[PDB]
């Protein structure tokens, strides 16, 4: 579809409409592979999806995948992304463990091959960073040809991760993280970009109307042939 831009009134409507788009894949009768984002943007969306699938056994051919992961330094516990996805949705929605596929540093080199063998991703539900990052593809360090790759954590990135994605302390920041690169993301059959808040308005303008550039990684997503963007009024404020 020519990129479809959906502008909702607020976070609540953005969240509801996004849940309806994802339900179109959840209700498909054959197997569907969905890569889903963590973070605060999808919290309400996941509350709607929880109410739609909790206690229902007939969505057993829906397989869920994390698209990035940050392990806890010196700890054997599950990483931050799958942990947040369980808290936001897999646990309360009662998703079967055999339908949850975890990406880690250990299986990253086989992740792209496993997805193609499973029929490829039907949908990726992603968020947009204030700086235009998507998944773990950050400004300037992003390479568009990258598939699933390991990214070293150095310098200022230590405090940024400790304070934000981890929301704990310096000691738990590992040496590196894994992310599906832009090529792996673009390989999905369909993309659903959810955007909320004034802090994302500039990044959204650069994605919709700006040039394709590694400085604003998500700018490459406008090249996808099947992209739907669901933004609230605050996030769409800079669009013309």
């Amino acid at each position: 579809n020519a990129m479809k831009m959906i502008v909702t009134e607020d976070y609540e409507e953005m969240s509801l409409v996004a849940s309806h788009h994802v339900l179109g894949y959840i209700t498909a009768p054959r197997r569907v592979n969905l890569a889903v984002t963590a973070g605060s943007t999808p919290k309400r969306m996941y509350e709607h999806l929880t109410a739609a699938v909790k206690g229902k056994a007939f969505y057993d051919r829906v397989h869920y995948y994390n698209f990035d992961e940050i392990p806890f330094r010196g700890q054997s516990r599950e990483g931050v992304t799958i942990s947040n996805l369980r808290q936001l949705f897999f646990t309360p929605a009662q998703i079967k463990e055999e339908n949850i596929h975890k990406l880690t540093l250990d299986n990253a080199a086989q992740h792209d091959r496993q997805l193609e063998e499973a029929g490829g991703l039907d949908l990726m539900v992603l968020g947009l960073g204030a700086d235009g990052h998507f998944c773990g593809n950050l400004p300037n360090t992003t390479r568009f040809h990258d598939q699933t790759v390991e990214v070293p954590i150095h310098g200022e990135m230590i405090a940024l991760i400790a304070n934000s994605e981890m929301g704990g302390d310096i000691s738990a920041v590992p040496n590196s993280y894994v992310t599906m690169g832009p090529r792996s993301v673009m390989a999905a059959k369909n993309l659903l970009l959810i955007v909320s808040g004034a802090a994302k308005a500039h990044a959204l303008k650069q994605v919709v109307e700006g040039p394709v550039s590694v400085q604003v990684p998500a700018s490459v997503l406008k090249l996808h042939p099947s992209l739907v963007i669901i933004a609230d009024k605050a996030a769409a404020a800079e669009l013309q």
Copy 2:
């Protein structure tokens, strides 16, 4: 068999799950053609669809179609089916008139050709009668090769239609009605059969496990390659 049988706890769950299946088509980014049923079975489903699309301008490529129609004798007003669909959904959901395609006795002969030119039906949401009828395809009088056809109203049919559709008023029963025949229904890319209540349990068993026969018209729907049935426990009680 591809046929997917979904058994919900009750009418409320049946209605919610059915709305999520229809939202998969409503949220598709390109044009979709949906034929939708009237009657009491879909009332709650339409309440959910109303809340999902009311006041939203981004589902403007969704086109809706009635699959049968009974005009009011001697009156030029719209028939009973489109009138019930407006009350149950098009009016409260604020569906644009340009996205509502009415089937009448006058345009029936051109209906099948107009649908194929519009790309064919993407989905038909139909109900199941206690006698196994679907659309206006009634027991014994149904012909499986029929496309969109006019059906004369005679004998006992007059009182049945007057009481079930026109509040027992026999003077408003017309000479005939129009219905998409079994071949026209089967030409849809996907079928969604919604069934609720103990009164439908026997018909549902005949459809899922019985032989293909004109005596139980809906029995032919099990031959469709893309059928999803959403029934509540009461309607699924005779299934093994």
Copy 3:
């Protein structure tokens, strides 16, 4: 698609056009499941498909399936259908054995479940009998709700099968055969019906313009939402021009 009727000049054109339709599935980049017919109608079509895929390793996600099978009575060899499919296409086209899925009396009870697990049939290429049969769904004995089933061979059926399949040898006609029933056939995502010759003109008219009836089994195929018929002029002669 509203049933699409393609009328070609003769058997050669019918065969070429049919090969192009099947190549649309063979060239799909992901896995496709194709159920393919034996008999004389598809012989030339298979010669075109052989030339298109022989010695090519990039169509390795195409899986082929027989839709019926008649074993040789008292013999342990492969049945007549898979044997004819190997001679007409799998052998000369060099199709890998891992991409050939055999239906037999022994695995019939699991056939429908195995197809759905593999993603269902993408296409079924079938022929039309002079009596309107398709697969092993013969007149009057056909039941439209049937999935993959075993069919007993009795009375006149014995000589008909011996002469049309086992070179008139009645000792090789078994007690029964297996066929994908009308419901299993209709479950395919797409149907391609190939028809050639004056002997099929009456059956084709009954299918395209006649009522749905067990007397002419293929008459039910006009209810499928994705059917393409490729007939030559001789087979289309009774259709209303």
Copy 4:
């Protein structure tokens, strides 16, 4: 969608035959399909096979064909080089109806992207790969990946590049500008089929399959498409890692 599929054929003849079979998968689709098709010497044999498959057949009447670039002849009012070559290579001998031929020109370029979306979008684009990695009229360094259908001024070295790749080395008829579907418009197609033949394209093909995404080698961005099939002959695939 499919992880990019790389098909390596023995020679130009096999490349041409296999490419015709892939396109026939769209031509035989029962509903309307929109195909954008390339001119040039690479698809000549492919078009001969497609001509034999559709000539004298009235049942492929819902197949609509589109040119993805156009270079008018300077000071001449005749049709441009792309639609002219497509007619000579295929539309004329294949007897394609004029109502199924949709021409892109400088005059209707501003409405081209909107007309395609209204028609349901492109189902397939059959494109060639230049020795320098160009695709359509998206040439090295001057290409912008966010571009949709745009007019491109012709200046300096671009005169010989356009004359040799589009107008058979004739520099005298090179106009002031040309029109091309930009990388964003190309990437909007539902499926891409990249055909590549000859030793002169081996380096560009390696940069596309194994190199980074760069405007220096425009076709390098096509590896981001979720539904790409590449059909190359041995000579063109010679630099790919065995």
